[PDB]
């Protein structure tokens, strides 16, 4: 998690994506699986945006722009968010309770899918 | 809390993207440097000089409430910080979060 | 109202910034040798010719400039149309128009 | 025999002998309307009793020595029978120079020092070199350091190796105490009362009330308030030099919200200028200077240098100069550099007890070394080889 | 022609179902229906049990130098820091362990039916 300071795909197609995330406690350079580049492009991630990336799934959520760039324009339709406080890499060991019905309903219908039948569903 | 910009449009300029927007009240006049998203919002909803509009700054929600030269131009400050209070029922929360575009079910049944 | 071109705004900004380097604002109470520009022009200092005074100047900041009110200093959402000065309230706009807009009083 | 250490700054001259303490004396002449025909030189400003409307005759413009007559007079007063009684023919002088000093100024320095005074030997260095020497003497295990010299007329950021100055990575920010004082004058004159002729008093006000904010916009919101909650707002009583010799801040318990006081004291109320003025050091673009601030310039200077040396530079940030005495300066610099520095690299920012006299202590230390005689340039060698070898030996 | 209905609600309502990733488990370890049409019986039953990576192989490949360049076709320490390097090698070990754990997790599930069964059973 952090503000994006650099987003550079490395061509061999793309072998990997090098990203730079900034927080109050420093800067970290990360090598991303090339499949995450599609997620980053879909989320419209640019330098100065505050994002988080899931290590296990590659999911990207762009949760606004950094408030340090709030004065770059006098009127933009943007949601400006503070810079994250902790480290870029956050680890948490959690215990979550689920029921068998939750697993049943998760497998009743497909999720996502870029096909036309999936989108119409 | 939200920031609400209500005024009369004086001049709107968009060039191949960068743009400027000039808004006035009965007490003050200002020129704004526009971003890409606000430029897109102002292009989608046709805004020309003389229109009295209100803008929600965070969302680009532009609603034209008439033309002035018919509604009188706003008087006080152009940019106002407003406190908006919503009372939302539990059913409304459930329906909005039931599915994508699920709020439509609040009006057409189909829950 | 009248409108000032980019040259006038840049000249005003340069004049204000240069005035901050002045030794004194008044004149000599007694009322009765070079300067920095003469030193620079005598040095014949060229860019990219190794480290020097010109190449040591700090580059533009990455973070965007933050607007502040030219009257009271608090953050200013508004920009004056005539001269481009920033301001934050109707009272501040009136004060700016009376004091420093157009003619520089 | 003896060695004289001089830090010929644009605002204060740190002059002293190697075997003695350090003295801080203004390096400029003064004229006042209370004296018809009388020009004050150096520390003679203490003699005047009404420093209002004081006129400054400076030997430095934009941080470089450009007026030679006033500088010569100040040096003659400092070296005269009244101050130090310097025996020029048997004394060595360590005098500091601005960064990237022009060739003409260096020639004039060499000529004046070796002919008009005829010093035995001269060592012309930069204040950062002496600060780095002092830091390395204090910390023998460190191989690199980065020096921030936020002074009167500029703020340089120079990285130093053990015995070499990285000339490629020197970055100058054209914001100094002079600019901050003039900006404070302009703000006060435009907002409350005309003080453009009160440079001394406004400088004291800046030294007394200004501070660096950890949270800029929270402080702005607090200052915008009215009443008890406006903790930032304070009342300053300017000195009239009749019954109030020196300026002071009214106690918070004694503050009056209305601003009207029965006593006829000329009270200057400062709310947002407390941290707006110091912020120009960190954000030059606030007032209109399109230059990177101190933390960003530190990061840029370090990152220009090779990768292997970067963590050492990040571990030895040293703050020198008068502007570093602002409250919250060290913490703000540390926070911003930590935000910009890679997480794997540790950040350490050190503010010495007396950043004014750091360079003088470094000069004293380098004078006490047994390698001192090799660094200086003698007059006997000056006669033949001097004008080239002065440039050759000194790493300006 | 009428303008649409503008239904205004609290911004907090739109985040009611949202849960931070550090507060939720990975539900892809129970995703059986997502494997259909993408994962085959060969991958689950024959290939992966034989060609799963091990920690030893992963570490050997990571530590070993880069392979020699593929031949062209023929028609026939003063600034060294110990703490920084210890941190870097700990980070590398953590990265390799994460790679191993994710590779095991992403191929653990076998399809209920599989691509081969569906293709065989799917008439024109
Ligand atoms: N307590 C203080 N708080 C804030 N500023 C201070 C304080 N004391 C001194 N200053 C400022 O420190 C500056 C002078 O610092 P110095 O570094 O000694 O200047 P100088 O080195 O003689 O000139 P340069 O920059 O080396 S050419 C002045 O602008 C003062 O306003
Ligand atoms: Mg100095
Ligand atoms: Zn204002
Ligand atoms: Zn104006």
Q: Mapped to the 3 state alphabet, what secondary structure does chain A carry? A: CEEEEEEEEEECCEEEEEEEEEECCEEEEEEECCCHHHHHHHCCCCCCEEEEECCCCCCEEEEEEEHHHCCCCCECCCCEECCCCCCCCCCCCCCCCCCHHHHHHHCCCCCCCCCHHHHHC
Q: Beta A26-32 vs A49-53: how paired, if at all?
A: unpaired
* d(C-alpha B23, C-alpha B52), whole Å: 9
Neighbours of ion ligand 4 (CB under 5 A): C 80, 82-83, 85, 101
What angle is formed at CA D217 by the lines to CA D216 and CA D222, rounded to 5 degrees? 100
Rounded to an integer, what is the distance from CA B33 to the centroid of its chain?
A: 16
Q: Which domain holds residue D224?
A: 177-282
3-class secondary structure, D211: coil
- b/e D232-267 (16+ beta carbons within 10 angstroms → b): bbbbbbbbeeeeeeebeebeeeeeeeeeeeeeeeeb
Backbone angles phi, psi at A65, to 5 degrees: -100, 155
Backbone angles phi, psi at D170, to 5 degrees: -70, 125
Q: A4 pairs with which residues across the strands? A: A21
Per DSSP, the residues of B11-27 read EEEEE--EEEEEEE-SS
The neighbour count for residue D30, using CB atoms within 10 Å, is 21
Helix axes D329-340, D294-304, angle to 10 degrees: 50
3-class secondary structure, D197: coil
Q: Which residues of B touch C83 (CB under 8 A)?
A: none
Method for structure elucidation: cryo-EM
Q: B33 pairs with which residues across the strands? A: B20
What angle is formed at CA E110 by the lines to CA E106 and CA E114, rounded to 5 degrees? 120
Nearest of B39, B21, B80, A71 to residue C81 by alpha carbon: B21
3-class secondary structure, D102: coil
Helix axes D294-304, D273-282, angle to 10 degrees: 10
Compare CB distances from A110 to E21, E22, E33 and report the shortest one's residue: E33
* d(C-alpha D319, C-alpha C55), whole Å: 23
Backbone angles phi, psi at D90, to 5 degrees: -135, 40
Q: Which residues of B touch A72 (CB under 8 A)?
A: 35
* d(C-alpha D109, C-alpha D75), whole Å: 12
Q: Beta B2-15 vs B79-82: how paired, if at all?
A: antiparallel
Report the nearest-CA residue for atom 1 of ligand 1: D207
**Do E and D touch (≥3 CB pairs < 8 Å)?**
yes
Q: Is the CB of D64 under 6 A from ligand 1?
A: no
Contact assessment for residue D202 and residue D188, using Cβ atoms and an 8 Å cutoff: yes
* d(C-alpha D99, C-alpha D172), whole Å: 9
DSSP secondary structure code for residue D90 in this structure: G
Determine whether the interchain pair A106/E25 forms a contact, defined as Cβ–Cβ distance below 8 Å: no
DSSP secondary structure code for residue D315 in this structure: T
| Cβ neighbours of residue A94 closer than 8 Å, sequence gap 6 or more | E22, E23, E24, E25
DSSP secondary structure code for residue D6 in this structure: E
Contact assessment for residue A24 and residue A84, using Cβ atoms and an 8 Å cutoff: yes
**Binding-site residue ranges of C for Zn(2+):** 69, 72, 80, 83, 88, 92, 96, 101
Contact assessment for residue D105 and residue D65, using Cβ atoms and an 8 Å cutoff: yes
Minimal CA separation from B91 to chain A, in Å = 22
Nearest of D390, D367, D388 to residue D378 by alpha carbon: D390
Rounded to an integer, what is the distance from CA C86 to the centroid of its chain?
A: 14
**Binding-site residue ranges of C:** 69, 72, 80, 83, 88, 92, 96, 101
Nearest of D192, D57, D43 to residue C26 by alpha carbon: D57
Minimal CA separation from C19 to chain A, in Å = 27
Hey, of D145, D311, D313, D347, which one would you mutate to test binding to chain E, going by the most E CBs within 10 A of its CB? D311
Backbone angles phi, psi at B10, to 5 degrees: -100, -50
* d(C-alpha B100, C-alpha E49), whole Å: 40
- b/e A102-120 (16+ beta carbons within 10 angstroms → b): eeeebbeeeeeeeeeeeee
* d(C-alpha D258, C-alpha E22), whole Å: 52
* d(C-alpha B105, C-alpha D215), whole Å: 45
Say which residue the tokens 């988080």 belong to: A52
DSSP secondary structure code for residue B7 in this structure: E
Determine whether the interchain pair E22/A90 forms a contact, defined as Cβ–Cβ distance below 8 Å: yes
CATH class, domain A1-106, is: mainly beta
Tokens, residue D354: 């007396």
* d(C-alpha C105, C-alpha C95), whole Å: 12
Contact assessment for residue D285 and residue C65, using Cβ atoms and an 8 Å cutoff: yes
* d(C-alpha D274, C-alpha C73), whole Å: 11
Report the nearest-CA residue for atom 22 of ligand 1: D9
Query: C77: exposed, middle or buried (C-beta count within 10 Å: 0-12, 13-18, 19+)?
Result: buried
**Is residue A104 within 8 angstroms of chain C, CB to CB?**
no
| Residue C31 region by backbone torsions, left for phi larger than 0, else alpha for psi between -120 and 50, else beta | left
Q: Edge-to-edge strand order for the sheet containing A26-32?
A: A26-32, A14-23, A2-11, A49-53, A60-66, A80-81
- b/e D107-138 (16+ beta carbons within 10 angstroms → b): eebbeebbeebebbbbbbbbbbbbbbbbbbee
Nearest of D352, D355, D345, D340 to residue D297 by alpha carbon: D340
**Is residue B63 within 8 angstroms of chain E, CB to CB?**
yes
Nearest of D189, D330, A110 to residue E33 by alpha carbon: A110
**Do D and B touch (≥3 CB pairs < 8 Å)?**
no
CB pairs < 8 Å spanning A and B = 34
* d(C-alpha E109, C-alpha E103), whole Å: 12
Nearest of D134, D95, D133 to residue D114 by alpha carbon: D95
Compare CB distances from C74 to D220, D289, D290 and report the shortest one's residue: D220
Q: Which residues of A touch D338 (CB under 8 A)?
A: 24-26
* d(C-alpha D345, C-alpha E101), whole Å: 28
| Cβ neighbours of residue E60 closer than 8 Å, sequence gap 6 or more | none
The neighbour count for residue D147, using CB atoms within 10 Å, is 26
| Cβ neighbours of residue C87 closer than 8 Å, sequence gap 6 or more | C69, C70, C71, C76, C78, C79, C80, C93, C96
DSSP secondary structure code for residue C81 in this structure: T
Tokens, residue C3: 């409108």
Q: How far is the CA of A75 from the centre of ligand 2 (A)?
A: 43
Ligand closest to the CA atom of residue C70? 3
E27 to A38, B55, E32: CA distances (angstroms): 21, 41, 10
Q: Is the CB of D317 under 6 A from ligand 1?
A: no
Instruction: Specify the ligand 1 atom closest to the Cα of D320.
Output: 17
Nearest of E11, E6, E16, A105 to residue B94 by alpha carbon: E16
Contact assessment for residue D235 and residue D267, using Cβ atoms and an 8 Å cutoff: yes
The neighbour count for residue D20, using CB atoms within 10 Å, is 12
**Is residue E79 within 8 angstroms of chain D, CB to CB?**
yes
| Cβ neighbours of residue D217 closer than 8 Å, sequence gap 6 or more | C75
Helix (H), strand (E) at residue D366: helix D358-368
Backbone angles phi, psi at D338, to 5 degrees: -60, -40
| CATH code for the domain in which residue D188 is found | 3.90.640.10
* d(C-alpha D297, C-alpha D319), whole Å: 13
The neighbour count for residue B87, using CB atoms within 10 Å, is 7
Backbone angles phi, psi at A53, to 5 degrees: -125, 130
* d(C-alpha D196, C-alpha D185), whole Å: 6
Minimal CA separation from C69 to chain A, in Å = 14
* d(C-alpha D378, C-alpha D390), whole Å: 9
What angle is formed at CA D355 by the lines to CA D165 and CA D279, rounded to 5 degrees? 95
* d(C-alpha B111, C-alpha D265), whole Å: 73
Q: List residues in chain A touching E: CB distance below 8 A.
A: 52, 54-57, 59, 90, 92, 94, 96, 98, 103, 106-111
Rounded to an integer, what is the distance from CA D66 to the centroid of its chain?
A: 18
- b/e E77-96 (16+ beta carbons within 10 angstroms → b): eeeebeeeeeeeeeeeeeeb
> Among positive and negative, which fits the CA dihedral D24, D30, D35, D36?
positive
Q: Is the CB of D325 under 6 A from ligand 1?
A: yes
Q: How far is the CA of D127 from the centre of ligand 2 (A)?
A: 6
Per DSSP, the residues of chain E read --PPP-----TTGGGSS---GGGS--GGGG--GGGTTT--HIIIIIIHHHH---HHHHHHHHHSPPPPPPPPP-----S--HHHHHHHHHHHHHHHHHHHHHHHHTT----SS-HHHHHHH---
Ligand closest to the CA atom of residue C77? 3
The neighbour count for residue D199, using CB atoms within 10 Å, is 24
Q: How far is the CA of D154 from the centre of ligand 2 (A)?
A: 9
Q: How far is the CA of A49 from the centre of ligand 3 (A)?
A: 30
* d(C-alpha D282, C-alpha D275), whole Å: 11
- b/e D325-353 (16+ beta carbons within 10 angstroms → b): bbeebbebbbbbbbbbbbbbbebebbbbe
Tokens, residue B98: 């039931």
* d(C-alpha D105, C-alpha B67), whole Å: 68
Hey, of D144, D302, D306, D308, which one would you mutate to test binding to chain E, going by the most E CBs within 10 A of its CB? D308
* d(C-alpha A32, C-alpha A40), whole Å: 10
Report the nearest-CA residue for atom 6 of ligand 1: D322
Q: Beta D234-237 vs B2-15: how paired, if at all?
A: unpaired
Q: How far is the CA of B43 from the centre of ligand 4 (A)?
A: 29
* d(C-alpha D159, C-alpha D151), whole Å: 17
Q: How far is the CA of C89 from the centre of ligand 3 (A)?
A: 6
* d(C-alpha D194, C-alpha C72), whole Å: 15
Contact assessment for residue D216 and residue D335, using Cβ atoms and an 8 Å cutoff: no
């Amino acid at each position: 998690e952090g503000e994006v300071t650099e987003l550079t795909p490395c061509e061999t197609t793309i072998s990997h994506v090098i990203i730079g995330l900034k927080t109050a406690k420093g800067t970290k350079q990360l090598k991303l699986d090339p499949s995450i580049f599609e997620s980053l492009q879909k989320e419209r991630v640019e330098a100065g945006d505050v994002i988080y990336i899931e290590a296990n799934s590659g999911a990207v959520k762009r949760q606004g722009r950094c408030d340090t760039y709030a004065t770059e324009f006098d009127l933009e339709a943007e949601e400006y968010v503070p810079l994250p406080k902790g480290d870029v890499h956050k680890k948490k060991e959690i215990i979550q309770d689920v029921t068998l019905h939750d697993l049943d309903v998760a497998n009743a219908r497909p999720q996502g899918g870029q096909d036309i039948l999936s989108m119409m569903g | 809390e939200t920031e609400i910009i209500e005024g009369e449009v004086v001049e709107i300029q968009i060039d191949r993207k960068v743009g400027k927007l000039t808004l006035k009240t009965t007490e003050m006049e200002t020129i704004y440097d526009l971003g890409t998203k606000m430029i897109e919002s102002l292009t989608k909803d046709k805004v020309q000089a003389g229109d009295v509009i209100t803008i929600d700054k965070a969302t680009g929600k532009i609603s034209k409430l008439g033309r002035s030269f018919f509604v009188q131009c706003p008087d006080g400050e152009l940019q106002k910080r407003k406190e908006v209070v919503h009372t939302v029922s539990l059913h409304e929360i459930d329906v909005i979060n039931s599915r994508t575009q699920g709020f439509l079910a609040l009006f057409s049944g189909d829950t | 109202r009248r409108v000032l071109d980019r040259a006038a705004r840049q000249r005003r900004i340069n004049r204000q910034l240069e005035a901050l380097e002045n030794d004194n604002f008044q004149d000599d109470p007694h009322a009765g040798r070079k300067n920095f520009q003469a030193l620079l022009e005598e040095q014949n200092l060229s860019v990219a010719e190794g480290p020097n005074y010109l190449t040591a100047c700090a580059g533009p900041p990455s973070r965007p400039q933050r607007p502040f009110c030219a009257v009271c200093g608090f953050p200013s959402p508004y920009t004056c149309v005539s001269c481009g000065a920033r301001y934050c309230t109707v009272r501040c706009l009136g004060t700016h128009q009376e004091t420093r807009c157009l003619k520089w009083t | 025999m003896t060695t004289l250490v001089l830090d010929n700054g644009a605002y204060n001259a740190k002059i002293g002998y190697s075997h003695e303490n350090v003295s801080v004396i203004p390096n400029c002449q003064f004229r006042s309307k209370t004296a018809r025909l009388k020009t004050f030189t150096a520390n003679q400003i203490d003699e005047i009793k009404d420093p209002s409307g004081l006129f400054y005759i400076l030997p430095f413009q934009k941080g470089y020595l450009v007026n030679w007559d006033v500088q010569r007079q100040v040096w003659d007063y400092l070296f005269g029978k009244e101050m130090y009684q310097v025996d020029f023919l048997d004394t060595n002088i360590i005098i500091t120079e601005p960064y990237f000093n022009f060739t003409s100024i260096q020639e004039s320095m060499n000529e004046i020092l070796f002919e008009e005074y005829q010093f035995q030997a001269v060592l012309r260095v930069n204040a950062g070199a002496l600060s780095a020497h002092r830091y390395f003497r204090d910390n023998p295990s460190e191989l690199c350091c980065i020096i921030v010299d936020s002074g009167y007329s500029f703020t340089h950021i120079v990285p130093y190796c053990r015995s070499k100055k990285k000339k490629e990575a020197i970055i100058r920010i054209n914001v100094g105490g002079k600019l901050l004082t003039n900006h404070l004058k302009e703000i006060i004159s435009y907002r409350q009362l005309h003080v453009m002729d009160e440079t001394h008093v406004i400088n004291q006000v800046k030294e007394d009330v200004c501070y660096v904010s950890q949270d800029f916009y929270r402080d702005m919101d607090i200052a915008k308030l009215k009443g008890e909650e406006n903790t930032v707002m304070i009342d300053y009583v300017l000195p009239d030099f009749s019954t109030i010799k020196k300026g002071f801040c009214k106690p918070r318990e004694e503050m009056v919200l209305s601003g009207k006081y029965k006593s006829g004291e000329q009270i200057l109320r400062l709310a947002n200028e407390r941290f707006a003025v110091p912020e120009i050091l960190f954000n030059p673009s606030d007032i209109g200077i399109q230059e990177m601030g101190i933390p960003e310039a530190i990061v840029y200077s370090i990152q220009n240098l090779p990768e292997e040396m970067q963590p050492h530079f990040f571990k030895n940030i040293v703050l020198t100069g008068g502007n570093s005495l602002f409250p919250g300066f060290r913490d703000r610099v540390y926070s911003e550099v930590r935000c910009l520095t890679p997480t794997d690299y540790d950040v350490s920012v050190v503010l010495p007890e007396n950043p004014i006299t750091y360079a003088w202590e470094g000069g004293k230390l380098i004078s006490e070394n047994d390698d001192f005689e090799d660094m200086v340039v003698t007059r006997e060698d000056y006669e033949e080889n001097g004008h080239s070898v002065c440039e050759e030996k000194f790493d300006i | 022609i009428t303008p649409g209905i503008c239904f205004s609600t609290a911004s907090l309502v739109l985040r009611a179902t949202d849960v931070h990733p550090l507060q939720r488990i990975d539900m892809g370890r129970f995703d059986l229906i997502g494997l259909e049409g993408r994962v085959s019986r060969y991958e689950a039953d024959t290939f992966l049990p034989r060609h799963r990576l091990s920690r030893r192989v992963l570490l050997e490949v990571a530590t070993a130098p880069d392979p020699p360049p593929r031949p062209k076709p023929v028609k026939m320490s003063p600034f060294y820091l110990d703490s920084l390097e210890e941190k870097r090698k700990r980070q590398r070990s953590e990265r390799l362990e994460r790679i191993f754990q994710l590779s095991e997790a992403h191929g653990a599930l076998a399809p209920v039916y599989g691509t081969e069964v569906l293709d065989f059973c799917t008439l024109p």
